[PDB]
């Protein structure tokens, strides 16, 4: 088994991914959510966000 089997991943789009579905594009870092934008519109009611305006 190899000793060089990974590359640094301490910043950028290689570091972070969605907590529900493991995707890397269009994720929300605001308030500590770390969901994908399509997964957020799916769970927003259970998390406690609403729309009024």
């Amino acid at each position: 088994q190899q000793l060089y089997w990974s590359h640094p991943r301490k910043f950028g789009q290689g570091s972070r991914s969605c907590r529900v579905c493991s995707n890397r594009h269009g994720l929300i870092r605001k308030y500590g959510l770390n969901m994908c934008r399509q997964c957020f519109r799916q769970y927003a009611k259970d998390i406690g966000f609403i729309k009024l305006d």
């Binding site: 990974s6 907590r19 529900v20 493991s22």
Partner: protein, 98 residues
Amino acid sequence: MLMPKKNRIAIYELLFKEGVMVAKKDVHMPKHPELADKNVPNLHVMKAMQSLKSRGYVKEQFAWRHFYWYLTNEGIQYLRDYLHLPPEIVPATLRRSR
């Protein structure tokens, strides 16, 4: 080799004692948490529990990047044999709820 026999016994003894297992779907983290300290990676836990599922000795569930496993009666029979324990032991769950 898949893993040293020292690792394989430490997964099965923790599974038999606790009655359940939990792990995340990531092959790269160097240590499984909890009583799998003293050096076994969670890649060995995923690969060990997969081999135990296809024999019928555990049930499996999955949600949000985590596996869940439950031990069952044929698996209790097989692990009590493999670990050489006395035939009277059932260490995980026994007392009737109210």
